Amino acid sequence: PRGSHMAKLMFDSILVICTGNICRSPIGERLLRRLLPSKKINSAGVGALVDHAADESAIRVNGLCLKGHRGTKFTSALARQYDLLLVMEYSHLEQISRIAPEARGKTMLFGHWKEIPDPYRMSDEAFDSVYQLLEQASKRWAEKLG
Ligand code: NI
């Protein structure tokens, strides 16, 4: 979990997790990717829309592209491939413990330095407020990991 130059040794892979894997986690993944170019950053959804491209609204919103993103179901097998798991909603943690018991010990909230709301099927203003949350949350994580 901490706390400096040591963090770079402990976490080289990060799994960003939301519900549908077409709004929140796609954005968070891309944000962390250009902040941590050396790390393995992917995403999944506890109730993902498998093989679905990123949501239209999420795509619209700063200026970063969601290139080649497809919906990915979260599985214990997948958790086994990542040092750190970041979830958007607190409910995800509980659903993670249920799906992958071994992963719970290595999962925290995206924006640990409050949870991020589900923008799915909401106004563009909601996507902006959420995006803002994702960006600043992604920055606090970038510094806390080098
Ligand atoms: Ni479909």
Author numbering: -4 to 56, 60 to 111, 115 to 147
Article, verbatim:
The function of these proteins is crucially dependent on phosphatases, which are homologs of either Cps4B in Gram-positive bacteria or WzbK-30 in Gram-negative bacteria. Since the dephosphorylation of bacterial tyrosine kinases, such as Wzc and CpsCD, is a crucial part in the capsular assembly process in both Gram-negative and Gram-positive bacteria, the phosphatases represent potential targets for drug development efforts. Furthermore, we show that both Wzb and Cps4B are capable of completely dephosphorylating full-length Wzc, establishing that Cps4B activity is not confined to its cognate CpsCD complex.
The two structures superimpose with an rmsd of 0.3 Å, and although the phosphate-complexed structure is partially disordered, the active site is well defined and the positions of the two ligands are identical. In terms of tertiary structure, WzbK-30 is essentially identical with the NMR structure of apo-WzbK-12, with an rmsd of 0.8 Å for 132 superposable Cα atoms. Briefly, the enzyme has a mixed αβ structure with a central four-stranded parallel β-sheet surrounded by seven α-helices. The active-site cavity is marked by the reactive Cys13 residue, which sits on top of the β-sheet. The WzbK-30 structure is a product complex, containing a phosphate ion that is coordinated by residues Arg19 (N, N1, N2), Gly15 (N), Asn16 (N), Ile17 (N), Cys18 (N) and Asp119 (O2). The phosphate is positioned such that the phosphorus oxygen bond is in line with the S atom of Cys13, correctly oriented for SN2 attack. Previous biochemical data have established that a Cys13Ser mutation eliminates phosphatase activity, and the structure confirms that Cys13 is indeed the catalytic nucleophile. In WzbK-30, a conserved tyrosine residue (Tyr117 of WzbK-30) is believed to be important for binding of the phosphotyrosine at the active site.
